Each structure stands twice: as structure tokens, then as C-alpha cells.
């Protein structure tokens, strides 16, 4: 019933690089999803105490949310775009695994994932 510590967003010993795909992931992908009318449930870790979801972290073992992804993109945590794409996919999958079909939260994730998939389809070639 308690919340875990949040995912890691800072690790000085992880090697980092600034690349055009990672810049696209922040400037196009994250920003597009973050401003959406359905973004709010995904802008921060699930607070299972205040939301009264005592079994959430019993089921979800790799929590992920766009607040964590945003901080990671600010902190160069991902060496490559596939790592950040994986974090978005984990966020959507957690929602589909935990909830029931047709719940509001699932409809919201699906609308964000539709936009995510379209933006990833146009991920630029590495420079
Ligand atoms: C403010 N955040 C929410 O309301 C929120 N965010 C997520 C990803 C969920 C919830 C509660 C609905 C059911 C659980 C769920 O997956």
C-alpha cells in the first residue's frame, strides 16, 4: 500500500551524449504529449496512497511516468532514443496491465499513445 521511491533520474556515472534523436524526443514527442488534455494522470508517479490503490505496486514493478521521462531528457540519462522510447512504452503498458478496458485512464493512455506512435514514426535519421 506504500509508494516506492521514484525511478532514478540522475546518475553522474552513466555516460551521456546530446543527439538529434534525443532532442526530437524532448522537443517534439514529450512536449506534444505533455500539453495534451489527457496528460495530467501521467505527469508524475502514481501516488498509490492518495489515489487509494493499495495493490498498484503489487502489480506494477517498473513504474514510469512522463514526469520521470521529462527529467531524464533534461538530465541526458538515455544514451540513445530507444531507451527513452522504452520508458514511454512501459508507461502505457503499465496502464493497460493494471486497469480495465474502457476505464477513463485507459482511454487517456490510448489517445496519448496514438500521438506518440505517430511522432516516433517520424523519428529523424541520426546525424
Ligand atoms: C493523478 N494520477 C492518476 O489519477 C492516475 N494516473 C495513472 C497512470 C493511474 C491513475 C489513477 C487511475 C487508475 C490507476 C492509473 O493507472
UniProtKB/Swiss-Prot annotation:
Q: How changing residue 99 to A affects the protein?
A: Abolishes binding to acetylated histones
Q: How is it modified after translation?
A: Phosphorylation by CK2 disrupt the intramolecular binding between the bromo domain 2 and the NPS region and promotes binding between the NPS and the BID regions, leading to activate the protein and promote binding to acetylated histones. In absence of phosphorylation, BRD4 does not localize to p53/TP53 target gene promoters, phosphorylation promoting recruitment to p53/TP53 target promoters.
Q: Where is this site: Acetylated histone binding?
A: 99
Query: Site of the Glycyl lysine isopeptide (Lys-Gly) (interchain with G-Cter in SUMO2) crosslink?
Result: 58
Instruction: Name the domain of life.
Output: Eukaryota
Q: What residue stretch is flagged as signal peptide? A: none
Q: In which tissues is it expressed?
A: Ubiquitously expressed.
Q: Which residues form the Bromo domain?
A: 17-123
Compartment(s) where it occurs, according to its Swiss-Prot or TrEMBL record: Nucleus; Chromosome
Family the UniProt entry places it in: Belongs to the BET family.
Under the subunit heading, UniProt states: Interacts with p53/TP53; the interaction is direct. Interacts (via CTD region) with CDK9 and CCNT1, acting as an associated component of P-TEFb complex. Interacts with RELA (when acetylated at 'Lys-310'). Interacts (via NET domain) with NSD3, CHD4, BICRA and ATAD5. The interaction with BICRA bridges BRD4 to the GBAF complex. Interacts (via NET domain) with JMJD6 (via JmjC and N-terminal domains); the interaction is stronger in presence of ssRNA and recruits JMJD6 on distal enhancers. Interacts with NSD3. Interacts with NIPBL. (Microbial infection) Interacts with bovine papillomavirus type 1 regulatory protein E2. This interactions may serve for the tethering of viral genomes to host mitotic chromosomes allowing successful partitioning of the viral genome during cell division.
Other remarks on this protein: JQ1, a thieno-triazolo-1,4-diazepine derivative, and I-BET, a benzodiazepine derivative, have been tested on tumors with success. Treatment with GSK1210151A (I-BET151, a I-BET derivative) has strong effets on mixed lineage leukemia and promotes myeloid differentiation and leukemia stem-cell depletion.
Task: Note what the entry says on domains.
Answer: The NET domain mediates interaction with a number of chromatin proteins involved in transcription regulation (NSD3, JMJD6, CHD4, GLTSCR1 and ATAD5). The C-terminal (CTD) region mediates interaction and recruitment of CDK9 and CCNT1 subunits of the P-TEFb complex. It is also required for maintenance of higher-order chromatin structure.
Q: What disease is associated with this protein?
A: Cornelia de Lange syndrome 6: A form of Cornelia de Lange syndrome, a clinically heterogeneous developmental disorder associated with malformations affecting multiple systems. It is characterized by facial dysmorphisms, abnormal hands and feet, growth delay, cognitive retardation, hirsutism, gastroesophageal dysfunction and cardiac, ophthalmologic and genitourinary anomalies. CDLS6 inheritance is autosomal dominant.
Q: What does this protein do?
A: Chromatin reader protein that recognizes and binds acetylated histones and plays a key role in transmission of epigenetic memory across cell divisions and transcription regulation. Remains associated with acetylated chromatin throughout the entire cell cycle and provides epigenetic memory for postmitotic G1 gene transcription by preserving acetylated chromatin status and maintaining high-order chromatin structure. During interphase, plays a key role in regulating the transcription of signal-inducible genes by associating with the P-TEFb complex and recruiting it to promoters.
UniProt-recorded name of the protein: Bromodomain-containing protein 4
Lineage, broadest ranks: Eukaryota, Metazoa, Chordata, Craniata, Vertebrata
Q: Which gene encodes it?
A: BRD4
